[PDB]
Amino acid sequence: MDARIVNALIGSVYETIRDVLGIEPKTGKPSTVSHIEIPHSLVTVIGITGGIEGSLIYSFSSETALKVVSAMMGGMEYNQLDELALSAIGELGNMTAGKLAMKLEHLGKHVDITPPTVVSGRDLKIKSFGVILKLPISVFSEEDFDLHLSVKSG
Amino acid sequence: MDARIVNALIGSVYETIRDVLGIEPKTGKPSTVSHIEIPHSLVTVIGITGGIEGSLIYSFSSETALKVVSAMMGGMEYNQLDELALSAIGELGNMTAGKLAMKLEHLGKHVDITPPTVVSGRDLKIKSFGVILKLPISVFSEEDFDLHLSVK
Numbered sequence: 001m002d003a004r005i006v007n008a009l010i011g012s013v014y015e016t017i018r019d020v021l022g023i024e025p026k027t028g029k030p031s032t033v034s035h036i037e038i039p040h041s042l043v044t045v046i047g048i049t050g051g052i053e054g055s056l057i058y059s060f061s062s063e064t065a066l067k068v069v070s071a072m073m074g075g076m077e078y079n080q081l082d083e084l085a086l087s088a089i090g091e092l093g094n095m096t097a098g099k100l101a102m103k104l105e106h107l108g109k110h111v112d113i114t115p116p117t118v119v120s121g122r123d124l125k126i127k128s129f130g131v132i133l134k135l136p137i138s139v140f141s142e143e144d145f146d147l148h149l150s151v152k153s154g
Numbered sequence: 155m156d157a158r159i160v161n162a163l164i165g166s167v168y169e170t171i172r173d174v175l176g177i178e179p180k181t182g183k184p185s186t187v188s189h190i191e192i193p194h195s196l197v198t199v200i201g202i203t204g205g206i207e208g209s210l211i212y213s214f215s216s217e218t219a220l221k222v223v224s225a226m227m228g229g230m231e232y233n234q235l236d237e238l239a240l241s242a243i244g245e246l247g248n249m250t251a252g253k254l255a256m257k258l259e260h261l262g263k264h265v266d267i268t269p270p271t272v273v274s275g276r277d278l279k280i281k282s283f284g285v286i287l288k289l290p291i292s293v294f295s296e297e298d299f300d301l302h303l304s305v306k
Contacts, residue, residue, distance in 0.1 A: 047201030047209075047268030054269060086281040114201030114268055115283045115304075117209055121275030127240045129269045152269040 001133055001151060004107050005052070006030045009135060009149055012099035017139060020092055021071040028136020028143065036132060036148055038124045044089055045126075046097045047114030051104060052154025054130045056097050058137075058147040065089060067140045081120075090116040109154070155287050155305060159206070160184050162257035163303055164289060170250040171293055175225045182290030182297060190286065190302050192278040194218070198247040199280075200270045202255075205263030208284055208305035210254070212247050216274075218298040219243060244270035 010027045017025045036057065043059035060068070062081060069088040070078035078085075097113040104111050130152030137145035164181045171179045190211065196219055198212040214222070216235060223232040223239045226246065232239060251267045258265050282304040291299040 043273070045199060045271050045273075047203070049201070049203045049266035049268055053266075055271060057271070083281075087283075090281065090283065112203035112266060114203050115207050115209065115306075117199055117201075117211070117283075118281035119197075119273055119275075119278065120281070121278045124273065124275040126274075127237075127244070127272040129241070129244065129271075150269070150271075 001032070001131060005104070005109075005149075005151075006133065006135075008103040008107065009056075009100055009133070012096050012103060013135070013137060013147065016096045016099050017092070017137075020095060021068065021139065023071065023139060025145075026138040028138065031134045031136075033132045033134045033148070036126050036128060037146075038126060039146070041122060041124060042089065042118070042120045043124060043126065044093045044116050044118045046093055046116050048097065048101075048111050049114070050111040050154070051109035052111050052151055054150040054152045054154070055128060056093065056100065056147070056149055057126065057128065058093055058145055059124075060145050064140060064144040068092065086118045086120070090118045111154070155186070155285055158261055159258075159303075159305075160287055160289070162254055162261065163287070166250055166254035166257055167289070167291060167301065170246070170253050171291065171299075174246055174249055175222065175293065177225070177293060179299075180292040182292070185288035185290075187286050187288045187302070190280045190282050190288075190304075192280060193300055195276070195278060196243075196272065196274050197278065197280065198243060198270050198272050200247055200251045201268035202251070202265050203268070204265035205258060206265055206305055208303060209282065210247065210251050211280060211282070211302045211304070213300045213302075214298060218293075218295065221294050222246060240272055243272055
């Protein structure tokens with residue numbers, strides 16, 4: 001996969017979780033993986049079409065979901081994964097793909113971002129297609145966001 | 155939601171769950187829902203961009219899944235749900251969305267399709283965004299496939 005892409009992703013995650021959560025993230029080291037293990041119970045999926053067709057998938061614990069939402073809410077404490085709570089997460093990732101989309105444009109990659117689809121369950125397993133990039137991310141805890149970027153084509 | 159779309163969807167599903175699986179299915183009755191109530195454990199999610207922004211979410215069971223595989227793999231037998239089985243499952247949803255897209259093209263709207271993502275779990279709950287259309291499908295069992303098309 002193109003480092004430009006990998007970099008384009010990194011910047012989007014960095015800039016985004018800084019403006020929305022107000023905290024500077026710690027991007028980890030890029031890494032190709034064969035499948036996707038979800039240790040959590042909350043997973044979001046965002047499609048991408050065009051220059052590159054695949055996806056952006058990120059998940060995390062319920063405890064982290066809260067700190068996340070509470071952060072988007074300016075500071076208001078929180079502890080209830082209501083409907084808006086799911087929208088919070090969905091909004092976070094959407095804004096991310098939103099920035100990733102713009103950055104790919106500059107480099108000449110015209111892609112379109114799909115709305116998010118937030119899934120939550122117990123023993124979760126996902127099956128994506130294309131080459132799976134893994135980007136380690138530390139927001140509040142050490143690596144509390146295990147994000148992936150699939151590229152079927154592009 | 156533009157019935158001209160539900161139109162392209164049910165026909166797409168129909169014409170696809172028909173040629174790929176060789177069986178004509180019964181499309182239930184189009185419903186409008188406030189959210190997606192997941193009655194199964196395996197979902198196939200496919201996204202739409204362009205003319206419309208939304209998704210296509212097939213919901214089916216593990217049992218229902220292997221019957222699709224066998225129905226695709228020349229009708230032989232299939233017991234485990236391994237990667238191949240999975241890739242088959244996606245292609246089916248993918249071939250559908252592909253036809254939905256193709257029908258959309260002829261009515262003005264230009265849309266692009268995302269590759270599918272199969273997810274599975276205990277106590278599933280999918281949060282979707284936008285307006286939603288529910289369409290029940292019966293292939294083998296009665297309503298063994300519940301599909302949702304959330305939009306813009």
